């Protein structure tokens with residue numbers, strides 16, 4: 700029934716919608732196009748920050764390690780990094796900037812700390828995600844071309860990974876709490892999944908967008924009185940210059956919430 704509602708939303712949206720919900724109260728899933736590939740865009744920033752948190756388990760000072768920010772490093776969306784050009788940010792600062800402000804320069808420093816987009820993929824594989832692939836750096840990982848396998852995952856795989864990272868044992872306890880704290884402090888998410896939820900349903904999320912009107916969000920949610928949920932909503936459209944549709948994500952989330 701919920702799949703039929705998501706189908707109706709998708710049909711009136713003009714685009715292609717992917718949804719994965721895990722309800723941790725019972726482990727049950729709702730999936731819509733759950734095994735189709737979608738471009739991740741900045742939702743991939745969660746995997747890169749989590750990989751750096753995992754590194755920090757064996758290097759307790761890692762998050763205070765300074766990283767030089769040079770003029771040439773700046774890319775196309777650098778609201779935090781631009782303040783630090785010719786200076787340094789720590790890996791904690793870059794993680795917070797990437798996750799909470801979606802800073803693309805900050806993401807690039809995370810990727811570099813992992814040895815390139817392949818290192819981020821390696822971390823995903825290590826935590827049991829056989830699906831995620833990061834192929835490119837910022838900003839080109841957001842080209843979101845239909846059919847292109849690069850920088851994609853499926854909603855099912857991303858939900859299962861987000862659950863392991865934020866609620867399971869993929870990370871040490873400190874690190875898990877740090878990741879959840881960062882997601883719950885996101886600045887960019889009030890129009891997306893969380894717009895479709897009751898106000899009482901606490902949450903953290905990471906948005907993404909790109910060409911092809913691609914509009915994404917992944918969230919960990921604490922519904923009032925209930926065990927947490929993990930929700931992935933991915934959306935992409937047929938034309939390169941299509942406009943973002945955060946409202947579609949909100950609509951998906953609302954359908955999911957009403958179906959619980």
Ligand SMILES: O=C(Nc1cccc(-c2nnn[nH]2)c1)c1cccc(C(F)(F)F)c1
Nearest residue numbers: 723724725726859862863864866867868869
């Ligand atoms: O804990 C899990 N499931 C679950 C669901 C409902 C109840 C319980 C439970 N009740 N009492 N002790 N565990 C556990 C669980 C299953 C797969 C994966 C994960 C993980 F690690 F969070 F991703 C957790």
Ligand SMILES: O=C(Nc1cccc(-c2nnn[nH]2)c1)c1cccc(C(F)(F)F)c1
Nearest residue numbers: 723724725726727862863864866867868869
């Ligand atoms: O799914 C369950 N546990 C589970 C399964 C697989 C992985 C994990 C898990 N991985 N990391 N942390 N928990 C937990 C689960 C669900 C209801 C009830 C129970 C219980 F408590 F054993 F009876 C377990």
Ligand SMILES: O=C(Nc1cccc(-c2nnn[nH]2)c1)c1cccc(C(F)(F)F)c1
Nearest residue numbers: 775776800801802887906907908909910943
């Ligand atoms: O700034 C954003 N996108 C962006 C940045 C730079 C270039 C372009 C772009 N160039 N050509 N087509 N889009 C888009 C952007 C979009 C939605 C949401 C956010 C935010 F605020 F970080 F969450 C940023």
Ligand SMILES: O=C(Nc1cccc(-c2nnn[nH]2)c1)c1cccc(C(F)(F)F)c1
Nearest residue numbers: 741776801838839841842906907908909910
């Ligand atoms: O970098 C891009 N967008 C962007 C940048 C930073 C943050 C976000 C964003 N955050 N939350 N939702 N989107 C999007 C971007 C957009 C269109 C096209 C391209 C590309 F791939 F370079 F051509 C990049």
